[PDB]
Amino acid sequence: NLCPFGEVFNATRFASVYAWNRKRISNCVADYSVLYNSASFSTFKCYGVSPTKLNDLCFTNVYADSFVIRGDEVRQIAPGQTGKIADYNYKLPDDFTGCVIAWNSNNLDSKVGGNYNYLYRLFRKSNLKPFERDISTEIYQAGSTPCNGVEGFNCYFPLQSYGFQPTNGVGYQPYRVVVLSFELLHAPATVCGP
Amino acid sequence: NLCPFGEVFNATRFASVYAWNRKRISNCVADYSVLYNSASFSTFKCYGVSPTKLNDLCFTNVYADSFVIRGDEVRQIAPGQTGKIADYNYKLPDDFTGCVIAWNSNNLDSKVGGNYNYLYRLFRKSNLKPFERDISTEIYQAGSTPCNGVEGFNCYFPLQSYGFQPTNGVGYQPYRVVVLSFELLHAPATVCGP
Amino acid sequence: QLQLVESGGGLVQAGGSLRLSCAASGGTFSRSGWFRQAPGKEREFVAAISRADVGFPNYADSVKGRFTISRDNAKNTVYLQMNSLKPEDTAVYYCAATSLQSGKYDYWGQGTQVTVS
Amino acid sequence: LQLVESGGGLVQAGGSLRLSCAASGGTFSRSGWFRQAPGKEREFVAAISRADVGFPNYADSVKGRFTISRDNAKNTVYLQMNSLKPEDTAVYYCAATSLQSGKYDYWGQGTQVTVS
């Protein structure tokens, strides 16, 4: 019947961007004027599709990737962007077709002494491919010396903590993000809508 | 540090009881007599422990559950009680070891139109086990007849609403409850007292 | 004593979109529902909704997608938008509210005929 | 952001000390312990980050003999030292990483640990 977006947006805890949740969506009907006319998001862009015409489409599957980042980094969740998030944590491809939704979640993800449970990757050898996920915790080797699984000079543990604390400048406050991806297989589409 | 009761007691929103909320307390020092010698409490029970001589104790963990119920239902937050609350909503085990602290919150939870946001489960096939927490919304089958998701005679929507208004009787007025249960484990104590 | 007063059915072509309404005069309750009784058959459930969450709504399968229940806690009123009607929808539509005490549909409106051709 | 160590001393081989390190009072994203024997270079010992879900990391020499643990509310980080060996004699510094760069920028003064 009806798609379980609430199961995705009204979730209780979201993922760290470096370890971003993906949920496949199928065998349901999706009203997207449910969302965009509700809920008071900050960002609701679509690339390659017009947000009006969403209701009229039909897809084989829809993949919802949900994670959390601070607000100034939301600009990198867009095709052909770069920065520590788009390079090391979540890369959109340059021919991206989908939607990117975001909202402020200070009310919910920042602790008065500062919550530190949302991480991102700061060090990597290569840029992520589109829709790649990397969650290894190996010590990043920055110099000549190999690290042998041990931090210290030029050997860094790659996962960094966000300092999500209210009374942060809004650009350093937490934002929950949901990327919708619409997939087209040579098979009977199963997610449609009104 | 010094355990944050003010975060639980002085918190802005309180849960409806059927979805009561629990914060876990650990690795700090609790001055239980700022609360004892506080006032505006209408009920300050304790079980298996003495209400004075509290800061003489150490524990592995403390759990603070909290919710809103009616006046006449505070007697139901106690070992061995029965009623729609103690049976279907929040069950204290016969061997409870903690304290039950409740106070009147008319002037915060009762809007003049009547605040219907506070809910409580009115039907259930079976009783709650202790500290069990049920938040389903599936229609209640009272007869032999499958309900197939529909309401109607012997097919009830399980949750019910409190009619919270000022100038209700005091026992129909909104009360805010906090149940503190203490856990002694083969672990070392983490919560103590000065 | 709480009173429900419905307003507005009538005749509709197959495909039309009536809107039913209900004003609950001088009373308080937890959930409101719409029911229809066809000529001959037994009274049947259509949809309900409760006072707090316009996220607690239930619909009969034979109306999902087409009908929508609507709550206006201000005016103490419930609405039933009906779209894409079919002759199968031809019945008398009753509004009802569940008592704050027994959570059962105890208070009833006086019905209103809806005909679809 | 300031770090203080407290707890060393002399122990006959086989004993046990506990090092504690109060921070004033992060912020930072990961704290670890390092040690310096005289005439050696500063070896890594063990580390753990502020993020609840992990992420402990120990060198192999002290794997199983040492335990790190933090208390975020108190903003302190401890190192339990068991089964001590005379090879464990050195000065012990705790350090935290900057929330900005992932490098160990803030250092304690040191605390001397001897093992006869």
Structural domain harbouring C59: 3-116
Residue type, D61: S
Query: Is B88 strand, coil or helix?
Result: helix
Taking chain A, what is the end-to-end CA distance rounded to the nearest angstrom? 11
Residue B28 sits at the chain D interface (C-beta within 8 Å) = yes
CB contact at 8 A, A150 and A157: no
Exposure b/e, B47-84, CB count within 10 A at least 16 = b: bebeeeebbebebebbbbbbbbbbbebbebbebeeeeb
CA distance A192 to A58: 4
Number of domains chain A is built from: 2
Q: Are residues A142 and A193 in the same domain?
A: no
Residue type, B31: D
All residues of chain D having their beta carbon less than 8 Å from the beta carbon of residue A117 are 51-53
Candidates C44, C52, C105; nearest CB to B161: C52
HSE-CB at D87 with a 13 A cutoff on CA atoms is 6
CA distance C54 to A23: 26
Candidates C58, C73, C100; nearest CB to B151: C58
At least 3 CB pairs under 8 A between chains D and B: yes
Length of chain C (residues)? 117
Nearest CA in chain B to C48: B151
Nearest CA in chain B to C30: B161
Q: Are residues B149 and B108 in the same domain?
A: no
Q: Are residues A122 and A186 in the same domain?
A: no
Q: Do A123 and D51 touch (CB under 8 A)?
A: no
CA distance A138 to A121: 11
Q: Are residues B158 and B193 in the same domain?
A: no
CA distance D49 to C61: 52
CB contact at 8 A, A1 and A28: yes
Q: Do A161 and D102 touch (CB under 8 A)?
A: no
Q: Are residues B141 and B181 in the same domain?
A: no
Number of domains chain C is built from: 1
CB contact at 8 A, C44 and C35: yes
* Method by which the model was determined: X-ray
Nearest CA in chain C to B157: C103
CA distance A60 to D66: 53
Q: Are residues B57 and B130 in the same domain?
A: no
How many CB atoms within 10 Å of residue A2?
A: 13
Q: What is the resolution of this structure in A?
A: 3.1
CA distance A60 to A154: 47
Is residue C50 classed exposed, middle or buried when 0-12, 13-18 and 19+ CB atoms within 10 A define those classes?
buried
Which residues on adjacent β-strands are paired with residue B40?
none
Residue C33 sits at the chain B interface (C-beta within 8 Å) = yes
CA-based nearest distance A180→chain D, Å: 28
Residue D1 token pair:
């952001």
CA distance A61 to A185: 8
**Neighbors of chain B with 3 or more C-beta pairs under 8 Å:** C, D
CB contact at 8 A, C116 and C14: yes
Residue A108's nearest CA partner among A68, A157, A56, A148 is A68
H-assigned helices in B30-142: 32-36, 84-88, 106-109
Residue A114 sits at the chain D interface (C-beta within 8 Å) = yes
- H-helix or E-strand containing D115? strand D112-115
* CATH code for the domain of D57: 2.60.40.10
Residue A194 sits at the chain C interface (C-beta within 8 Å) = yes
CA distance B164 to B113: 9
CB contact at 8 A, D58 and D50: no
Which of C59, C67, C98 is the mutation pick for testing B, counting most B CBs within 10 A? C98
CA distance C96 to B188: 58
Q: Do C31 and B157 touch (CB under 8 A)?
A: yes
**Phi-psi map region of D9: left, alpha, beta (phi>0 left; psi -120 to 50 alpha):** left
- How is residue A8 annotated by DSSP? H
Q: Give Cα A87 to chain centroid, integer Å.
A: 13
At least 3 CB pairs under 8 A between chains B and C: yes
At least 3 CB pairs under 8 A between chains D and C: no
In sequence order, the 6+-apart residues with CB closer than 8 A to the CB of A56 are: A193
Residue C36 sits at the chain B interface (C-beta within 8 Å) = no
Residue A95 sits at the chain D interface (C-beta within 8 Å) = no
Residue B21 token pair:
């909320």
Q: Give Cα C37 to chain centroid, integer Å.
A: 11
Q: Are residues A7 and A70 in the same domain?
A: yes
Residue B149's nearest CA partner among A191, C60, D84, D105 is C60
D 67-86 residues with CB below 8 A of A?
A: 72-73
Residue A122's nearest CA partner among A100, A80, A151 is A151
CB contact at 8 A, D32 and D22: no
CA distance D114 to D107: 21
**Neighbors of chain A with 3 or more C-beta pairs under 8 Å:** C, D
CA-based nearest distance A64→chain C, Å: 22
CA-based nearest distance C75→chain A, Å: 22
Q: Are residues A50 and A5 in the same domain?
A: yes
- H-helix or E-strand containing A39? none
User: What string of DSSP letters covers chain A?
Assistant: -B---HHHHS-SSPPBGGG-EEEEE-SBB--HHHHHTSTT-SEEEEESS-SGGGGG--BSEEEEEEEEEEGGGGGGSSTT--SHHHHHT----TT--EEEEEEE-HHHH--TT-B---EEE---SSPPPTT------PPEE-SSS--TT--BTTEE-SEEE--B-SSS-GGGSEEEEEEEEEE--SS---B---
All residues of chain C having their beta carbon less than 8 Å from the beta carbon of residue B119 are 52
In sequence order, the 6+-apart residues with CB closer than 8 A to the CB of C101 are: none
Q: Do A151 and D50 touch (CB under 8 A)?
A: no
Long-range contacts of the stretch D59-67 (C-beta < 8 A, 24+): D59/A150, D61/D87, D62/D88
CA-based nearest distance A105→chain D, Å: 19
Residue D24's nearest CA partner among D103, D109, D87 is D109
Q: Are residues B104 and B121 in the same domain?
A: no
How many CB atoms within 10 Å of residue B144?
A: 6
* Pair type for strands D9-11 and D112-115: parallel
Residue A29 token pair:
């009907």
CA-based nearest distance B156→chain C, Å: 7
Which residues on adjacent β-strands are paired with residue B152?
B155
CA-based nearest distance A37→chain C, Å: 15
CB contact at 8 A, A102 and A176: yes
Chains A & C: contacts with CB separation below 8 Å: 3
Q: Are residues A87 and A182 in the same domain?
A: yes
CA distance B179 to D3: 39
Q: Do A151 and D47 touch (CB under 8 A)?
A: yes
HSE-CB at C96 with a 13 A cutoff on CA atoms is 23
CA distance B169 to B162: 13
Residue D112 token pair:
């001397």
Q: Are residues B6 and B96 in the same domain?
A: yes
CB contact at 8 A, C41 and C102: no
Residue B28 token pair:
């700090």
Residue B7's nearest CA partner among B61, B64, B56, B50 is B64
Which residues on adjacent β-strands are paired with residue C113?
C92
All residues of chain C having their beta carbon less than 8 Å from the beta carbon of residue A194 are 65
Q: Do C64 and A194 touch (CB under 8 A)?
A: no
- How is residue B13 annotated by DSSP? -
Locate tokens 């489960």: which residue?
B121
Query: Is D81 strand, coil or helix?
Result: strand
Nearest CA in chain A to C65: A194
Residue C42 sits at the chain B interface (C-beta within 8 Å) = no
CA distances (Å), D110 to each of A61, C10, D33, D95, in order? 58, 88, 10, 10
Q: Tell me: cis bond preceding D14? Omega within 30 of 0 counts.
A: no
CA distance A48 to A69: 24
Q: Are residues A95 and A69 in the same domain?
A: yes
**Phi-psi map region of B97: left, alpha, beta (phi>0 left; psi -120 to 50 alpha):** beta
Residue C43 sits at the chain A interface (C-beta within 8 Å) = no
CA distance A160 to D22: 21
Residue B73 token pair:
């239902």
CA distance D83 to C25: 79
Exposure b/e, A12-45, CB count within 10 A at least 16 = b: eebbbbbbbbeeebeeeebbbebbbeeeebebbe
CA-based nearest distance B100→chain C, Å: 26
Locate tokens 């971003």: which residue?
A20
Structural domain harbouring A159: 114-165
- H-helix or E-strand containing D45? strand D43-49
Is residue A91 classed exposed, middle or buried when 0-12, 13-18 and 19+ CB atoms within 10 A define those classes?
buried
Residue A3's nearest CA partner among A33, A48, A37 is A33
Residue C54 sits at the chain A interface (C-beta within 8 Å) = no
CA distances (Å), C75 to each of B7, B54, C31, in order? 37, 52, 15
User: What string of DSSP letters covers C17-52?
Assistant: --EEEEEEET---SEEEEEEE-SSS--EEEEEEESS
